[PDB]
């Protein structure tokens, strides 16, 4: 018996996983001076 | 680790590969080498061998291609998917295609060919993506200059083929488990509001707004820091985090290593050369008093005066009763000092110099 | 004949979205006197 | 003599590569004023 044909393609590949949450922003400079 | 579905493997122990075409990104030799070396990481831990035939049909055809290329899995241009490989088998079987649209390098720059190749070749031998974040077989490109198989990749690959005939027997780095007693630390810092604990080439990110501990390669944020840190402390005043490794340190401003590091600790701080390294460190809330622990003695540095304080080689066992003889890590949070040694964490009270609460090192997590 | 070539590999998956941006740094300290 | 049937499907394409670290957030607000100086 003659060899058959190839099967279809494997199902889609999984979506890639999300990324790592970015690092927190830099702390704000200190407030202004005080009212004498 | 995960063995590809269907358990594809090669029947022939002596394989051959071929670099069909080349990328105009790196000199043909740097590529031959990069691939040569990569194939070695796998053969180093198995009975397998990888010979390179310069023409004809090889068991693994390596090529560089763009977008669509007669193979069902088109590339996405720059970024994202860097490459793919097919499980073992005849014809297209066991092949590797690198997304040419990428800038392939032989350095630290984005997309070091060697590091991306070692992964691909994992699929080419019969391995699939590992759920272990520290494995080479983890669907994520990270790179700290070095490229090795993690104990996980070694186990998985030897599950398919067996061990190297080498008499010594190679071993890889193991990944830490947040909730596992016996877990210990190298350094603990408070980078910007959160707290990051370090263990090997990994960090465990703890943030108040979120419930989960995040484990990952320290290289995610800082590729150029040295592997295996010794101490680390944040200095609010100058939004800086200093990491220590032996006789010198690195200053990081958020996500960027400052210009000029590493830098020796003796010149920058003033330690005796008898101190070959720092064991732990933490700096006062706002008083600018950084403490560096060295074995059973500690030093206090005045951040503002940029110089040590009056005769400070003091014993820890005095100004800090109880805590112990050695410190692995330390950090200040809520006016309290949390000392870490071995598996125990002490909640030291600076105000009344008293050990308030002994507790598990991993206690700070959700276990 | 042979019930045959197993068939080609399915296509690779999309790349995952970037990582969410981090929070806005803690407010500054109360200025000097 | 007769041509055999079709082979099985195909291996599922490999998963997608992971995302990319997030940008670090923006700096915070400036702090509140400071206590009164001289009278
Ligand atoms: Ca092949
Ligand atoms: Ca790409
Ligand atoms: Ca290119
Ligand atoms: Ca340490
Ligand atoms: Zn391809
Ligand atoms: Zn992969």
Curated annotation (Swiss-Prot), chain B:
Disulfide bonds join 179-367. Residues 1-177 are annotated as: Metalloprotease. Ca(2+) 3 binds at residues 76-77, 79, 81, 99, 102. The modification Phosphotyrosine is found at residue 261. It comes from Homo sapiens (Human). It comes from the Eukaryota. The modification Phosphothreonine is found at residue 175. This is Interstitial collagenase. Zn(2+) 2 binds at residues 119, 123, 129. The record marks 170-171 as: Cleavage. The active site is at 120. Ca(2+) 1 binds at residues 25, 100. The chain holds residues 100 to 466 of 469 of the full protein. Zn(2+) 1 binds at residues 69, 71, 84, 97. The record marks 44 as: Not glycosylated. Ca(2+) 4 binds at residues 186, 230, 279, 328. Glycans are attached at residue 21. Ca(2+) 2 binds at residues 59, 91, 93, 95. Hemopexin repeats lie at residues 176-225, 226-272, 275-323, 324-367.
């Amino acid at each position: 018996g003659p060899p058959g044909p190839p099967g279809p393609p494997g199902p889609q590949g999984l979506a890639g996983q999300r990324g790592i949450v970015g690092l927190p922003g830099q702390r704000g400079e200190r407030g202004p001076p005080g009212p004498p | 680790f995960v063995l590809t579905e269907g358990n594809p493997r090669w029947e022939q122990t002596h394989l051959t590969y071929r670099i069909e075409n080349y990328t105009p990104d790196l000199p043909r030799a740097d590529v031959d080498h990069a691939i040569e070396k990569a194939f070695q990481l796998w053969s180093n831990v198995t009975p397998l061998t990888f010979t390179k035939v310069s023409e004809g049909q090889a068991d693994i055809m390596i090529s560089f291609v763009r977008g669509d290329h007669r193979d069902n899995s088109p590339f996405d241009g720059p970024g994202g998917n860097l490459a793919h490989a097919f499980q073992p088998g005849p014809g297209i079987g066991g092949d590797a295609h690198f997304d040419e649209d990428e800038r392939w390098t032989n350095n630290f720059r984005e997309y070091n060919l060697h590091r991306v190749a070692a992964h691909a070749l994992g699929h080419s031998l019969g391995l699939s993506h590992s759920t272990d974040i520290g494995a080479l077989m983890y669907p994520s490109y990270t790179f700290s200059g070095d490229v090795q198989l993690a104990q996980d990749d070694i186990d998985g690959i030897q599950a398919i083929y067996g061990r190297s005939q080498n008499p010594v027997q190679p071993i890889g780095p193991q990944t830490p488990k947040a909730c596992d007693s016996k877990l210990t630390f190298d350094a603990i810092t408070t980078i910007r509001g959160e707290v990051m604990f370090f263990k090997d080439r990994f960090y465990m990110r703890t943030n108040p707004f979120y419930p989960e501990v995040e484990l990952n390669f320290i290289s995610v944020f800082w590729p150029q820091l040295p592997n295996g840190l010794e101490a680390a402390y944040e200095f609010a005043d100058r939004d800086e985090v200093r990491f220590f490794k032996g006789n010198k340190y690195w200053a990081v401003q958020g996500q960027n290593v400052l210009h000029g590091y590493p830098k020796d600790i003796y010149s920058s701080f003033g330690f005796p050369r008898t101190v070959k390294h720092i064991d732990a460190a933490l700096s006062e809330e706002n008083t600018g008093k950084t403490y560096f622990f060295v074995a059973n003695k500690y030093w206090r540095y005045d951040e503002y005066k940029r110089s040590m304080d009056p005769g400070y080689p003091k014993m820890i066992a005095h100004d800090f009763p109880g805590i112990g003889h050695k410190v692995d890590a330390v950090f200040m949070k809520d006016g309290f000092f949390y000392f870490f040694h071995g598996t125990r964490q002490y909640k030291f009270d600076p105000k009344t110099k008293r050990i308030l609460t002994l507790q598990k090192a991993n206690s700070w997590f959700n276990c």
